[PDB]
Design a protein around this ligand. Structure first.
Ligand SMILES: [Cl-]
Ligand SMILES: [Cl-]
Ligand SMILES: [Cl-]
Ligand SMILES: [Cl-]
Lengths: 101, 101
């Protein structure tokens, strides 16, 4: 937010494909208002959602380190499993090798 | 001008998988030293690389808007072609729907 804080050295990217455009839209609203605040409260630095097509996108979460990422994921795995029931989810994650700006 | 809506950031993700560690490492070095400085000079805000597995990762580029993102992409076909020679790639891109931090 207002502080630079930890350098985000670990990133998790969730690709999310919903069953329709309107279901996708509702999911994004849910990820903005409930999910992203929750993971930030648990240690995430930031979360962004990028739209790929009408019913799918990428949810990108930045973490200070792998350990924080693991911590959060462990805490929310039951909610993730529920998300997988309605959606096609693929999670890809790892360490930041470089950032240029 | 007055009634122009907000213009969202636009994100491009170039995901790569290489057949060997050498090709992966060469690709990372190419994103860092050739692709990044070029796109940043032409209007990208930032570029980072995230290693997702032994020989795979994501190159994530943030642009101020879609127009800039598309215009730059059209000018770096040589760079895309060079990365394609050494890797399986998938490019996914879109407007940012939200960022929470
Ligand atoms: Cl997460
Ligand atoms: Cl997965
Ligand atoms: Cl690009
Ligand atoms: Cl292939």
């Amino acid at each position: 937010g207002m502080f630079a804080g930890s350098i985000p050295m670990y990133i998790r990217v969730v690709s999310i494909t919903a069953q329709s455009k309107l279901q996708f839209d509702m999911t994004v609203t849910y990820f903005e208002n409930v999910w992203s605040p929750k993971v930030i409260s648990l240690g995430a630095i930031s979360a962004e959602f990028v739209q790929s097509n009408e019913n799918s996108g990428m949810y990108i979460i930045h973490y200070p380190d792998k350990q924080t990422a693991i911590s959060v994921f462990d805490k929310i795995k039951p909610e993730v499993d529920e998300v997988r029931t309605q959606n096609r989810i693929q999670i890809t994650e790892g360490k930041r090798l470089f950032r240029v700006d």
